[PDB]
């Protein structure tokens, strides 16, 4: 048993078989797993062919677009002390990571960045989804447009004295044209004033009726001074056809925030091809919990 | 011995754990989710069948 099963010297066996047997079985398995690997690689190559390089074959899952934000809050809560500096570091590092991509040094020269209307405008079509006219051109987006939340004056962006900012952003979708609501008698209360057709409005409020009073002055910063996204930055042509593309951003300062109390703030974008979902709490709108405990 | 033997015991746990995951949720968070309640309702039905 112990010895005979490990190595016997009459039949010249190791673990149970002889030499020529181990060689035949090992050779068979090597050839077999090679045919298997080759077939899998071929059936996967035909699939890499089938698809196009400038457009995902199916665009029904990412639609309509979401609404993400910086900072990066875990559980959608932004809690920090106004005294301890090591409390809002994880937030500033994120905010900075996001704004660090809009540096003017990056947007330099004629290419591939071109100047666009300083005031909201209409769509801009740079052709079809081809490679004919090379890399398309994207509109520039300056940092300074965001007035008090730019990290250029007060690097912290506000967290230093109980006045935080929230840079909202619309999820990039290929060939998506944003459509704002029209001036007809049916429109929310808020949206009536400053109906710039070319701007997609974003407006934050309180989840509960009580919290209204405890929330102060929501000051939105954006392109042209409006609380929205200019339609001129659309549509998006995809990474392959528009590398070095910048999406608009909207800053929100929650001035006059009550101290030592959890406030639930829900921000929401409005528009025709915009729809919310009771399951996905980031589709079109977003929720943030702020508590400036000091 | 059938419903409470040796392999089914682990499944009995999966069901327990999941139910506790739903309770800490409904007691704490406003407007919770329900993947845990239906997971428990599905697991229990498997040990029973």
């Amino acid at each position: 048993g112990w010895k005979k099963f490990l190595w016997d010297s009459e039949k010249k066996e190791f673990l149970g078989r002889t030499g020529s047997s181990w060689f035949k079985i090992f050779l068979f398995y090597l050839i077999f797993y090679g045919c298997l690997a080759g077939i899998f690689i071929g059936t996967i190559q035909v699939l890499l062919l089938t698809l196009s390089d400038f457009e995902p074959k199916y665009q029904d899952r990412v639609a309509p677009p979401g609404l993400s934000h910086a900072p990066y809050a875990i559980k959608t809560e932004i809690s920090f002390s106004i005294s301890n500096p090591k409390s809002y570091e994880s937030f500033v590092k994120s905010m900075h990571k996001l704004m660090d991509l809009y540096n003017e040094s990056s947007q330099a020269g004629n290419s591939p960045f071109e100047d666009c209307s300083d005031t909201p405008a209409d769509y801009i079509k740079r052709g079809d989804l081809d490679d004919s006219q090379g890399q398309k051109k994207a509109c520039r987006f300056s940092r300074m447009w965001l007035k008090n939340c730019s990290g250029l004056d007060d690097t912290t962006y506000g967290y230093a004295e109980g006045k935080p900012c929230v840079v909202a952003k619309l999820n990039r979708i290929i060939g998506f044209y944003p459509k704002p609501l029209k001036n007809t008698t049916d429109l929310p209360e808020e949206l009536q004033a400053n109906y710039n057709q070319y701007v997609l409005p974003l407006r934050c409020a309180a989840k509960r009726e009580e919290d209204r009073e405890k929330i102060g002055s929501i000051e939105y910063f954006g392109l042209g001074g409006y609380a929205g996204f200019p339609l001129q930055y659309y549509p998006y042509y995809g990474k392959r056809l528009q590398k070095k593309y910048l999406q608009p951003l909207l800053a929100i300062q929650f001035t006059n925030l009550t101290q030592n109390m959890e406030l639930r703030i829900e921000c929401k974008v409005y528009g025709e091809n915009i729809d919310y979902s009771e399951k996905d709490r980031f589709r079109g709108r977003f929720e943030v919990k702020i508590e400036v405990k000091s | 011995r059938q419903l409470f033997g040796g392999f089914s015991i682990l499944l009995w746990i999966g069901a327990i754990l999941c139910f506790l995951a739903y309770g800490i949720q409904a007691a704490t968070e406003d407007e919770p989710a329900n993947d845990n309640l239906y997971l428990g309702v599905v697991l229990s039905t498997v040990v029973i069948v």
Partner: protein, 244 residues
């Protein structure tokens, strides 16, 4: 024993390779209860091959039920194939929805984070958390179906070990019942209006059902030849190695 390989390989690549989970808990329970209960019971009822009395008796000392050859056919040869068949349906679902294969290695850490609503795909689009979880679930359902499809083949080849099915014949009624019923279970759970909320299975588009077909035909043809060589050459290499 063959279905063990496709259920374990996903948890392995997931942890090692860091990719999105190909098979989950609900889908796995669906495999065990669907393709392993009724088809297995049908096998008991099988008829006798026309060789049963034309073969020598058995020596219990030299011939056992579970020997080193059963694990060779199930785990090694047939299993690895059902695993590749399910991996194809997975890769196909993601590539079409925007996530390609090269970009998938390492996205798990970022994929499984409820907080990154900005996940960027290959074509450069930005995905939220449930929008990408939906595609992952469409992969769990596809895997499932690719398993039932490959099971079709494994079951057919299991009827006989020395004769062909063209010789033995499809006169077993319970086994047929099993093929039609499983197919029905997969179509029902994938298309019913409400499994989404309760079980987490999503509808499958028509071009996907066919991804497992090449791997299902290869298993059948392989076993058929594997047998021709047995019938013609007794005491050869094939009979010493793969005859269980």
């Amino acid at each position: 024993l063959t279905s063990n390989i496709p259920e374990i390989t996903p948890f392995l690549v997931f942890i090692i390779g860091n990719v999105p989970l190909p098979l989950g808990t609900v889908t796995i329970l669906c495999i065990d209860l669907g393709t392993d209960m009724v088809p297995a019971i049908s096998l008991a009822y099988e008829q006798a091959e026309s060789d049963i009395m034309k073969r020598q008796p058995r020596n219990p000392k030299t011939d056992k039920l579970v020997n080193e050859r059963l694990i060779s056919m199930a785990y090694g040869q047939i299993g690895m194939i059902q695993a590749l068949g399910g991996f194809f349906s997975y890769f196909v679902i993601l590539a079409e929805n925007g996530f390609l294969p090269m970009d998938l290695i390492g996205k798990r850490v970022r994929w499984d984070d409820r907080w990154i609503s900005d996940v960027e795909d290959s074509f450069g689009q930005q995905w939220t958390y449930e929008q990408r979880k939906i595609v992952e679930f469409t992969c769990h359902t596809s895997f499932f179906i690719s398993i039932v499809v490959v099971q079709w083949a494994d079951l057919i080849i299991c009827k006989t070990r020395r004769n062909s099915i063209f010789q033995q014949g499809m006169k077993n009624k319970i086994l047929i019942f099993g093929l039609f019923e499983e197919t029905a279970l997969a179509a029902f759970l994938s298309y019913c209006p409400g499994t989404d909320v309760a079980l987490r299975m999503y509808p499958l588009k028509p071009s996907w059902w066919f991804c497992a077909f090449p791997y299902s035909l290869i298993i059948f043809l392989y076993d058929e030849m594997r047998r021709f060589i047995i019938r013609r050459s007794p005491g050869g290499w094939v009979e010493q190695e793969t005859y269980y």
